[PDB]
Amino acid sequence: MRALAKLAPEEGLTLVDRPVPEPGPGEILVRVEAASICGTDLHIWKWDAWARGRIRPPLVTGHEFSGVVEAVGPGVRRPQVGDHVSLESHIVCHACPACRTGNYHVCLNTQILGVDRDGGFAEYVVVPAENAWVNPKDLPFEVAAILEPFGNAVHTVYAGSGVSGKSVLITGAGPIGLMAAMVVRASGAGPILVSDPNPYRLAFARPYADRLVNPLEEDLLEVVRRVTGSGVEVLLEFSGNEAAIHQGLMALIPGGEARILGIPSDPIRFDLAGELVMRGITAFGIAGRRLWQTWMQGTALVYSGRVDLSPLLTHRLPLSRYREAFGLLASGQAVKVILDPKA
Amino acid sequence: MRALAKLAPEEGLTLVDRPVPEPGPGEILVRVEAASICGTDLHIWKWDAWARGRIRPPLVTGHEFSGVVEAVGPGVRRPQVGDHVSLESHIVCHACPACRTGNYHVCLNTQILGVDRDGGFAEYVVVPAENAWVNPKDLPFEVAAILEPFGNAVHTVYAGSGVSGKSVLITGAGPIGLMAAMVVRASGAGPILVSDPNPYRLAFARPYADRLVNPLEEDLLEVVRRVTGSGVEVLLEFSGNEAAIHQGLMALIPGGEARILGIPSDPIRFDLAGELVMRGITAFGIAGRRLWQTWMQGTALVYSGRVDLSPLLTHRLPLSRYREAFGLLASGQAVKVILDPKA
Amino acid sequence: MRALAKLAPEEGLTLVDRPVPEPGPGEILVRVEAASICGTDLHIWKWDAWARGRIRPPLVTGHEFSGVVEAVGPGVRRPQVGDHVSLESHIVCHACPACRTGNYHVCLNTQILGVDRDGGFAEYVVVPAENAWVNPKDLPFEVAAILEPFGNAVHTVYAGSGVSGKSVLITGAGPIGLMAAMVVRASGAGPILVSDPNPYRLAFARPYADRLVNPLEEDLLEVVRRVTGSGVEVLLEFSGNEAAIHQGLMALIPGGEARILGIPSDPIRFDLAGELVMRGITAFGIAGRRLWQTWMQGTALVYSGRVDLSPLLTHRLPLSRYREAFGLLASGQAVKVILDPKA
Amino acid sequence: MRALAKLAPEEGLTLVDRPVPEPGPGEILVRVEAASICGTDLHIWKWDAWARGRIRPPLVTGHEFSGVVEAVGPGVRRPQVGDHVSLESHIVCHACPACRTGNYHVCLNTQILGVDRDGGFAEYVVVPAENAWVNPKDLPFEVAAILEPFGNAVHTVYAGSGVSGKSVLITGAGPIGLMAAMVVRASGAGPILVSDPNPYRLAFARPYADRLVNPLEEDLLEVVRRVTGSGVEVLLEFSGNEAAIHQGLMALIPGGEARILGIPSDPIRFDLAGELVMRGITAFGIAGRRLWQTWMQGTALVYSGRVDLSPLLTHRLPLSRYREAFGLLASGQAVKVILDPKA
Ligand SMILES: NC(=O)c1ccc[n+]([C@@H]2O[C@H](COP(=O)([O-])OP(=O)(O)OC[C@H]3O[C@@H](n4cnc5c(N)ncnc54)[C@H](O)[C@@H]3O)[C@@H](O)[C@H]2O)c1
Ligand SMILES: NC(=O)c1ccc[n+]([C@@H]2O[C@H](COP(=O)([O-])OP(=O)(O)OC[C@H]3O[C@@H](n4cnc5c(N)ncnc54)[C@H](O)[C@@H]3O)[C@@H](O)[C@H]2O)c1
Ligand SMILES: NC(=O)c1ccc[n+]([C@@H]2O[C@H](COP(=O)([O-])OP(=O)(O)OC[C@H]3O[C@@H](n4cnc5c(N)ncnc54)[C@H](O)[C@@H]3O)[C@@H](O)[C@H]2O)c1
Ligand SMILES: NC(=O)c1ccc[n+]([C@@H]2O[C@H](COP(=O)([O-])OP(=O)(O)OC[C@H]3O[C@@H](n4cnc5c(N)ncnc54)[C@H](O)[C@@H]3O)[C@@H](O)[C@H]2O)c1
Ligand SMILES: [Zn+2]
Ligand SMILES: [Zn+2]
Ligand SMILES: [Zn+2]
Ligand SMILES: [Zn+2]
Ligand SMILES: [Zn+2]
Ligand SMILES: [Zn+2]
Ligand SMILES: [Zn+2]
Ligand SMILES: [Zn+2]
């Protein structure tokens, strides 16, 4: 079995060759058909702070993957051999406050596939049976591979009051913010504004946004004010950029909602009273995918065709050419990159 | 000025010549550009049980309309002369338990234009200033004229948990149901099924619904089982047909939501324990339009093009030819019929 | 081991003597310390329609019970030997629409302890480990035994908009409606009205209600109107009595919520339009306990002392004297009856 | 008439003799029976940064008061002469995006009695008719006078998911925090912890909180760990102290809610990713009182006795002795100080 792994406390990844793992009680063996990469894999790649204080080599990485169920552990009745399944990366403890409360997306003992244990950057991987989401056989594995990150967008968009019949400002047109714009557009939001200084990705939202904006070339606040008449009702933050955050909040009309998925790199300067309290803003910190509700909403949009994730898949490279795949990541020249573990 | 009114407790309406109403404090004078007809108007027209117990001749009917603010009463700050407006038919008291709660759509003292007082089937109509929703000057009056019934659809769809990423079944492809079909399609529901025995009407849903069903030709329940694998998460009831209701409630999965706008003509046989309680269903009684929240969502969808009502405007006729107009609606071989009070 | 079981398709129960069951994978063995009875056990007792079309003798009954964890199945890490636990009677499939959706209280393949499989009317019983709710050692088993039905009240009360700062009308002062009145009173509802023609139980709510009402001796509608000024905001239905249902709905102000737990014996005559739709009422069909959310809210009220369930425990009889316990049930002369399986 | 006003941009206030204001269209004349003082009034009194940028002398201050409707302007249907009323300090415009949404508490054009125009620190005050909340004639004016700040507590507590059956931590035992403590206790929260270094104040919470904590004496976080076994489900922030905020946000369990009313004096250092996003926390910015929804809930609790504010009224003094009154509040050795404008 071909697999991509982090073998030591250092930069880069190593294409190794492991024995096909066997599933046990409550587990299944997935024969990966497609996998994708995101900023998290990049952190590991670069072997930065985050990675250093979290990754325990040796580890086969990859948390965005899809495939077929090859065999199941003893006593596993679901899913079944032959099922096409996408994977939920978070493995929840089912024994902490968050889990009783039903907030599995924030289980205090979360274990992320490809971050804490072997992931999908391999021809085969073993995962908990409860983490497999069965997909119709006709859903392409390449789209199926990005359902996990798509779920991050879905969760952010549908959190709080949703976006149907509401004015939306999405700050950040990265892969996720991009899926968000696809979702909000299909959810009936309007007007829909998407802001991102990078024109490459910003152009990707043109067919979904009502107004594209380069905060560097144009004054976002003024554009929003010209498009809505005042502010937006919902703010979907996917940039993690302090300047964008403060800007987004100002664009919000009093009493509106700010749904934040973006992870800033450093603590921000925040005027609680001015940006949140006095304006009656509600800030929703979005993490992971609401376990199952997010997957239902998301896959429903995808299965029925309300959204088409195909245009976000810019490159598909054999797993063996991972080096280039990660270079595209750092580059930013691609949206989502699919890795074929079979080559 | 030309006007259409019920001049005595009996069938039909009479084209009459009334003087132009005068707007006083807190009122405005609206020059009607377009008006539409609905089931209610048919009730009044036929003079059935419903009408007999609610209408008090002499009454100028018409509650679905739009026009220009030709004049405003002393002290009326908004809207303004020249403004293009759609009208909220319900006039609330601001002095009842419902109003104090914000549930203006169920004001204990609700008064309805074209029902309790003179409506829009005339060249001019005086309404409360606060009932005029100013539209963009470029919105076609015909569409503006049907924002009221559109709101009934909007209210129903966005009530409760909404429909984004949810399987939806719509019983009733009448005008309001079709509008609901447009809205849910534009809101990201899926799969989307619409049921109605009138083929002429069921057809207008073809571009919005994922599955059309003639309950007389097919077993709606079994069709839903195939389309969703079990039931729908949301049932939007717009028929008022007892059989449809029980059927619709059966197509609901346990824990689902039933949003009901439909007005059944007679009490129904209801197995409370079997159709609601034991299945954890929640039934939402939908009445009117949430004041402003519904208009915001609905006009947002319309203004931005998320939805396009134009295909619902099947007929146009001068007010002088109302007889023909009501006959059409009566036949059910029409969706939204527009009356022009100027001719 | 002493156990009470239904051994044949007939009335009554038989005190038998079985071998102590052994827990297996994912199971635990509970040494019951206290058990209680409700209308469901009564149905079985009487061997009526419900029971006949649901009970498969031989069966050890009882679903309201508490006790200590004696031993656990192999591989069970929670709960632990020594833990005091109350039991959730519903065993969910974790493989049906309702479960993905998180509505376990309505799992389509629910299996009720003491209704579909051996229950707690025995010194020992084996149940799924996930169904045990650990309680502090100092919570009396007698109170712990009724947490299950208390959860039915909690679920009804906190469904929808809750009751804090709201006027409440509870129709039905049976054991459950009684716990409800205790809950709403502790949740800050007010004014609080409790209606029940049976003065025995109606008096039990005196220390919790603001107004007790005998619908037979007094006109409920008038009392509500005198206490609130119009109607109540919330209706908690626990009687299943058609007359009470129609009455309760009328007492509701337009736009209010009706939370229904009560199971009517026959289909009711329901005027959808008049009692629900036109008044903008939302009817919440409450079933079971929201899996875990209900238990959290409920046990929180109980552990912190916000509510004291002690006064609802009117009788405690040895299990061997079940005959009398069931007679009290039918009698209605008691609230909750505790059965001591150790005698 | 006697009045207390800021007559120039500097410290202190001046007892002056102003003529009796006259109520015009849509207004009423209120004869003040009692008024209270709050932090805002202290700001104005000290003439600090906050005041300097908001106050425009000459200003009669006082926004927390109650009295009798002595007169009404032409056409004022409600309230009526003789009515006992409490006043909503915020005067909304009914013509901004916040108002159209119903979020009147954050009206873009909010005007505040005793801040932007003459308030209640006088024998008479003219206010908008719609700002008068009629109370039962038997409610003590002193209590009626503090329903405004009480509403800030109510709004905070019932925002989001409320507090029933939930563990709650309250940071800030200032007047509003104590009121929140009363409310949560009466709403069924538990365990309930309140934190504040001022022992004089922390003490008033003793009868409502389950655990009192002096963050200077004990480690609040570790105390919460012992009381709940982990964290609280809800954090009600009423201090505005940065340290308290971070601490409070840490005591929150993942997926919890932080409702913030507290106004920090300076921007804070906020690790958005660590304190909000990654932990799935939702921060609710609380401003003012939801118009009518908050007053309903709050007066409901008060009218029915679910809560009793009397113990919060620590001092009473004629308006002529405001100096003494402000000094007390300034020392923090007082909770709600009542000023009597008649003396
Ligand atoms: N909360 C969670 O569980 C979770 C999960 C996965 C990813 N994330 C985070 O969510 C964010 C979005 O993910 P992504 O893959 O799209 O990231 P990305 O870094 O690829 O995209 C961020 C985008 O922000 C844009 N941006 C920068 N400054 C901006 C500004 N001032 N205004 C508007 N846009 C601006 C950039 O052009 C960039 O395309 C990242 O910060 C990521 O780390 C969070
Ligand atoms: N609650 C409110 O405030 C409010 C406001 C306006 C209208 N309404 C009511 O809402 C409903 C919708 O309005 P509309 O103008 O679209 O009504 P409509 O009468 O034009 O349409 C009702 C449709 O139900 C269809 N139908 C009949 N039996 C059916 C069945 N067995 N299964 C599926 N469909 C079936 C009919 O063919 C018809 O097209 C009406 O009942 C109306 O009275 C309520
Ligand atoms: N939905 C569920 O999952 C679920 C679970 C358990 C029990 N239940 C049902 O909930 C209901 C309440 O349970 P319970 O144990 O308190 O039942 P119960 O039968 O002991 O009490 C019902 C009460 O209704 C009262 N009542 C009858 N007519 C009335 C009227 N006209 N007005 C006011 N009160 C009236 C009676 O005096 C009686 O005390 C029952 O119908 C029970 O079968 C439902
Ligand atoms: N958002 C709004 O519309 C609105 C309206 C009114 C008041 N407020 C604000 O709400 C807050 C509460 O009002 P108040 O009158 O009760 O305020 P207050 O100033 O009387 O009380 C604040 C309390 O915080 C306590 N405190 C200080 N450090 C603490 C710490 N480290 N941990 C715990 N407690 C600590 C203080 O001892 C003090 O008693 C204030 O900040 C006020 O400015 C906001
Ligand atoms: Zn990823
Ligand atoms: Zn967990
Ligand atoms: Zn109509
Ligand atoms: Zn009203
Ligand atoms: Zn029971
Ligand atoms: Zn299930
Ligand atoms: Zn104040
Ligand atoms: Zn405003």
Query: What is the DSSP secondary structure assignment for residue C307, as one 8-state letter?
Result: S
Question: Do the beta carbons of residue B148 and residue B171 sit within 8 Å?
Answer: no
* CATH number, domain with residue D311: 3.90.180.10
Rounded to 5 degrees, φ, ψ at A40 are -65, -50
Instruction: Say what angle helices D242-250 and D220-228 make with each other, to 10 degrees.
Output: 30
The experimental method, as deposited, was: X-ray
SS3 C182: helix
Based on the fold, state whether residues C124 and C262 are members of the same structural domain: no
Among all chains, which residue has been given the structure tokens 């939702």?
D282
Chain C nearest CA to A26, separation (Å): 12
Closest CA to B42 of B64, B24, B75: B64
Which tokens go with A250? 């100002």
Please report, to the nearest 10 degrees, the dihedral formed by the alpha carbons of residues D190, D195, D200, D201 taken in order.
-70
* Cα–ligand 4 centroid distance for D174 (angstroms): 5
Which tokens go with B11? 């069938």
Closest CA to A162 of A238, A252, A239, A234: A234
Residue B151 neighbours by CB under 8 Å, 6+ apart: B288, B289, B294, B295, B298
SS3 track for D11-43: CCCEEEECCCCCCCCCEEEEEEEEEECCHHHHH
Question: Do the beta carbons of residue D86 and residue D135 sit within 8 Å?
Answer: yes
Known binding site: residues of A? 38, 63-64, 93, 96, 99, 107, 176, 196, 201, 261-263, 286-288
Based on the fold, state whether residues B99 and B240 are members of the same structural domain: no
Closest CA to C196 of C241, C231, C232, C162: C241
The answer to whether A254 contacts D230, with C-beta atoms less than 8 Å apart, is no
Question: Do the beta carbons of residue B254 and residue B281 sit within 8 Å?
Answer: yes
* CATH number, domain with residue C228: 3.40.50.720
Decide: residue B174, CB within 10 A, 0-12 exposed, 13-18 middle, 19+ buried.
buried
The answer to whether C166 contacts D190, with C-beta atoms less than 8 Å apart, is no
Residue C52 neighbours by CB under 8 Å, 6+ apart: C9
d(CA B296, CA B288): 14
Rama region for D167: left / alpha / beta (φ>0; ψ in -120 to 50; rest): beta
For the annotated catalytic residues of D, the residue numbers are: 40, 43
CA–CA–CA angle D82, D83, D89 (5° rounding): 130
SS3 A214: coil
Q: Which residues of B touch A165 (CB under 8 A)?
A: 154, 158, 296-298, 300-301, 306
SS3 B287: coil
Question: Do the beta carbons of residue A282 and residue D283 sit within 8 Å?
Answer: yes
Residue C260 neighbours by CB under 8 Å, 6+ apart: B272, B276, B277, C156, C237, C245, C283, C284, C285, C286
Residue C205 neighbours by CB under 8 Å, 6+ apart: C170, C173, C178, C181, C194, C196, C212
Which tokens go with A157? 């968009």
**C-alpha to C-alpha distances, B145 to B34, B68, B340, nearest whole angstrom:** 6, 12, 11
Query: What is the DSSP secondary structure assignment for residue B20, as one 8-state letter?
Result: P
Which of C164, C230, C296 should one mutate to test binding to chain D, selecting the residue with the greatest count of D CBs within 10 A?
C164
Decide: residue A330, CB within 10 A, 0-12 exposed, 13-18 middle, 19+ buried.
exposed
Based on the fold, state whether residues A321 and A272 are members of the same structural domain: no
Please report, to the nearest 10 degrees, the dihedral formed by the alpha carbons of residues D254, D257, D261, D263 taken in order.
20
Q: What's the gap between Cα C185 and its chain centre?
A: 18
CA–CA–CA angle C141, C142, C144 (5° rounding): 55
Query: What is the DSSP secondary structure assignment for residue D117, as one 8-state letter?
Result: B
Closest CA to A184 of A234, A253, A114, A229: A234
d(CA A4, CA A125): 12
C339 lines ligand 3 (CB under 6 A): no
Rounded to 5 degrees, φ, ψ at C102 are 85, 15
Please report, to the nearest 10 degrees, the dihedral formed by the alpha carbons of residues C313, C315, C318, C319 taken in order.
-70
In chain B, what's the furthest Cα-to-Cα distance? 61
Among all chains, which residue has been given the structure tokens 């679905």?
B64
Which of D130, D290, D292, D297 should one mutate to test binding to chain B, selecting the residue with the greatest count of B CBs within 10 A?
D292
- Does D31 appear as a known binding residue? no
Residue C73 neighbours by CB under 8 Å, 6+ apart: C23, C24, C25, C26, C27, C28, C129
Q: Which residues of A touch C296 (CB under 8 A)?
A: 100-101
Question: DSSP string of B114-183?
Answer: TTTB--SSBSEEEEEGGGEEEE-TTS-HHHHHTHHHHHHHHHHHHSTT-STT--EEEE--SHHHHHHHHH
Question: DSSP string of D169-237?
Answer: EEE--SHHHHHHHHHHHHTT--SEEEE-S-HHHHHTTTTT-SEEE-TTTS-HHHHHHHHHSS-EEEEEE
Of D186, D190, D304, the CB nearest to C191: D304
d(CA D121, CA D2): 8
Among all chains, which residue has been given the structure tokens 């009842």?
B96
Instruction: Say what angle helices C147-158 and C175-186 make with each other, to 10 degrees.
Output: 60
Interface chains of chain C (3 or more CB pairs under 8 Å) = A, B, D
Nearest CA to ligand 4 atom 11: D262
B148 lines ligand 2 (CB under 6 A): no
The DSSP H or E segment spanning D90 is: strand D90-91
Question: DSSP string of B108-123?
Answer: TT-EEBTTTB--SSBS
Closest CA to B64 of B321, B292, B338: B338
Domain ranges, residue A311: 1-152+287-343
Mark out the alpha helices in chain A (DSSP H runs).
Answer: 39-46, 49-52, 97-100, 141-144, 147-158, 175-186, 199-202, 220-228, 242-251, 293-304, 322-331
Question: Do the beta carbons of residue B165 and residue B191 sit within 8 Å?
Answer: no
* Cα–ligand 7 centroid distance for B42 (angstroms): 10
For CA atoms B313, B319, B324, B330, the dihedral sign is: positive
Which tokens go with C162? 């809750």
Question: Do the beta carbons of residue C216 and residue C202 sit within 8 Å?
Answer: no
Strand partners, C210: none
Known binding site for NAD(+): residues of A? 176, 196, 201, 261-263, 286-288
Chain A nearest CA to D277, separation (Å): 4
Among all chains, which residue has been given the structure tokens 């129609």?
C246
Based on the fold, state whether residues C5 and C138 are members of the same structural domain: yes
SS3 C210: coil
Strand partners, A71: A29
Question: Do the beta carbons of residue B336 and residue B328 sit within 8 Å?
Answer: no
β B168-171/B192-195 pair status:
parallel
d(CA C341, CA C112): 20
Instruction: Say what angle helices C293-304 and C147-158 make with each other, to 10 degrees.
Output: 110
Among all chains, which residue has been given the structure tokens 């898949």?
A313
Closest CA to A156 of A255, A288, A253: A288
Residue B185 neighbours by CB under 8 Å, 6+ apart: B192, B207, B208, B209
Closest atom of ligand 1 to CA, residue A178:
16
The answer to whether A279 contacts D285, with C-beta atoms less than 8 Å apart, is yes
CA–CA–CA angle D289, A167, A216 (5° rounding): 110
Question: Do the beta carbons of residue D340 and residue D62 sit within 8 Å?
Answer: no
Our answer to whether residue A90 is catalytic in this structure is: no
Closest CA to D170 of D94, D232, D93: D232
Residue A81 neighbours by CB under 8 Å, 6+ apart: A69, A70, A71, A72
For CA atoms A152, A154, A155, A159, the dihedral sign is: positive
Based on the fold, state whether residues C10 and C148 are members of the same structural domain: yes
Question: DSSP string of A143-175?
Answer: HHTTHHHHHHHHHHHHSTT--TT--EEEE--SH
For CA atoms D41, D45, D49, D51, the dihedral sign is: positive
Rounded to 5 degrees, φ, ψ at B115 are -130, -55
SS3 D157: helix
For CA atoms C314, C315, C316, C322, the dihedral sign is: negative
Decide: residue D343, CB within 10 A, 0-12 exposed, 13-18 middle, 19+ buried.
exposed
Closest atom of ligand 3 to CA, residue C38:
15
For CA atoms D183, D186, D192, D198, the dihedral sign is: positive
Residue D93 neighbours by CB under 8 Å, 6+ apart: D99, D107, D108, D109, D110
Question: Do the beta carbons of residue D93 and residue D99 sit within 8 Å?
Answer: yes
In chain D, what's the furthest Cα-to-Cα distance? 61
d(CA D191, CA C297): 11
Best of A46, A176, A194 to mutate for ligand 1, by most ligand atoms within 8 A of CB?
Answer: A176
Nearest CA to ligand 4 atom 37: D198
d(CA D115, CA D59): 7
| Burial track C92-120 (b if 16+ CB lie within 10 A, e otherwise) | beeebbbbbbbbbbbbbebeebbbbebbb
Question: Do the beta carbons of residue D256 and residue D213 sit within 8 Å?
Answer: no
Number of domains in chain A: 2
Question: Do the beta carbons of residue D286 and residue D156 sit within 8 Å?
Answer: yes
Based on the fold, state whether residues A187 and A134 are members of the same structural domain: no
Q: Which residues of C touch B255 (CB under 8 A)?
A: 98, 101, 103, 105-106
Percentage helix, strand, coil for chain C under 3-state DSSP, each rounded to 5? 30, 25, 40
d(CA B99, CA B87): 19
CA–CA–CA angle A258, A261, A263 (5° rounding): 115
C119 lines ligand 3 (CB under 6 A): no
SS3 A336: strand
SS3 D120: coil
Nearest CA to ligand 3 atom 30: C244
Final residue in a domain of this structure, among C286, C310, C327: C286
Question: Do the beta carbons of residue D304 and residue A297 sit within 8 Å?
Answer: no
Q: Which residues of B touch D77 (CB under 8 A)?
A: 95
**C-alpha to C-alpha distances, B59 to B24, B37, B46, B93, B170, nearest whole angstrom:** 20, 15, 14, 21, 34
Final residue in a domain of this structure, among C265, C286, C307: C286
Closest CA to D29 of D133, D114, D123, D94: D123
D154 lines ligand 4 (CB under 6 A): no
Question: Do the beta carbons of residue B190 and residue B210 sit within 8 Å?
Answer: yes
Based on the fold, state whether residues C21 and C108 are members of the same structural domain: yes
Closest atom of ligand 1 to CA, residue A260:
1
Closest CA to C126 of C55, C25, C265: C25
Among all chains, which residue has been given the structure tokens 């059944």?
B264
How many other CB atoms are there within 10 angstroms of residue B113's CB atom? 26
Q: Which residues of C touch D189 (CB under 8 A)?
A: 306
Final residue in a domain of this structure, among D239, D259, D286: D286
Rounded to 5 degrees, φ, ψ at D230 are -165, -95
Ligand 1 pocket by Cβ (under 6 Å): A 38-39, 152, 171-177, 195-198, 201, 215, 238-241, 243-244, 261-263, 286-288; D 277
Best of B239, B289, B309 to mutate for ligand 2, by most ligand atoms within 8 A of CB?
Answer: B239
d(CA B57, CA C78): 73
* Cα–ligand 7 centroid distance for C230 (angstroms): 29
Contacts across the B-C interface (CB distance below 8 Å): 147
How many other CB atoms are there within 10 angstroms of residue D199's CB atom? 12
Order of all β-strands in the sheet with A59-60: A14-17, A2-6, A59-60
d(CA D131, CA D280): 38
Which tokens go with D110? 């909010």
* Cα–ligand 2 centroid distance for B268 (angstroms): 16
Decide: residue C182, CB within 10 A, 0-12 exposed, 13-18 middle, 19+ buried.
buried
Based on the fold, state whether residues B92 and B145 are members of the same structural domain: yes
Among all chains, which residue has been given the structure tokens 């006593």?
A75
d(CA C116, CA C54): 8
In chain C, what's the furthest Cα-to-Cα distance? 61
* Cα–ligand 11 centroid distance for C202 (angstroms): 43
**Beta-carbon-side half-sphere exposure of residue A100 (alpha carbons within 13 Å):** 19
| Span between the terminal Cα atoms of chain A, in Å | 11
Contacts across the C-D interface (CB distance below 8 Å): 71
Residue A6 is which amino acid? Answer: K
SS3 C71: strand
Closest CA to C131 of C87, C164, C95: C87
Strand partners, A170: A194, A236
Closest chain D CA to residue C228? D300
The answer to whether C106 contacts B254, with C-beta atoms less than 8 Å apart, is yes
Which of B236, B269, B277 should one mutate to test binding to chain C, selecting the residue with the greatest count of C CBs within 10 A?
B277
**Beta-carbon-side half-sphere exposure of residue B185 (alpha carbons within 13 Å):** 22
Here the contacts of B130-133 (C-beta below 8 Å, separation 24 or greater) are B130/B26, B131/B87, B131/B88, B131/B89, B131/B90, B131/B91, B132/B28, B132/B30, B132/B69, B132/B79, B132/B83, B132/B85, B132/B86, B132/B87, B132/B88, B133/B85, B133/B86, B133/B87, B133/B88, B133/B295, B133/B299
Please report, to the nearest 10 degrees, the dihedral formed by the alpha carbons of residues C234, C237, C241, C242 taken in order.
40
d(CA D204, CA D213): 12
Based on the fold, state whether residues D191 and D317 are members of the same structural domain: no
Instruction: Say what angle helices C322-331 and C39-46 make with each other, to 10 degrees.
Output: 110
Chain C nearest CA to D297, separation (Å): 4
Q: Which residues of C touch D (CB under 8 A)?
A: 154, 158, 162-167, 183, 186-192, 210, 296-298, 300-301, 303-307
SS3 A39: helix
Closest CA to A279 of A252, A244, A309, A301: A252
Question: DSSP string of A58-110?
Answer: SEE---EEEEEEEEE-TT--SS-TT-EEEE--EE--SSSHHHHTT-GGG-TT-
Chain A nearest CA to C129, separation (Å): 12
Is the link from the previous residue into A25 a cis peptide, with omega within 30 of 0? no
Based on the fold, state whether residues A304 and A263 are members of the same structural domain: no
Based on the fold, state whether residues B43 and B171 are members of the same structural domain: no
Question: Do the beta carbons of residue D286 and residue A295 sit within 8 Å?
Answer: no
Closest CA to C42 of C340, C334, C318, C343: C334
Of A78, A100, A102, the CB nearest to C102: A102
Mark out the alpha helices in B251-321 (DSSP H runs).
Answer: 272, 293-303
Chain D nearest CA to B84, separation (Å): 17
Rounded to 5 degrees, φ, ψ at C73 are -70, 165
- The H helix count followed by the E strand count for chain D is 12, 19
Based on the fold, state whether residues A89 and A138 are members of the same structural domain: yes
Rounded to 5 degrees, φ, ψ at C143 are -75, -45
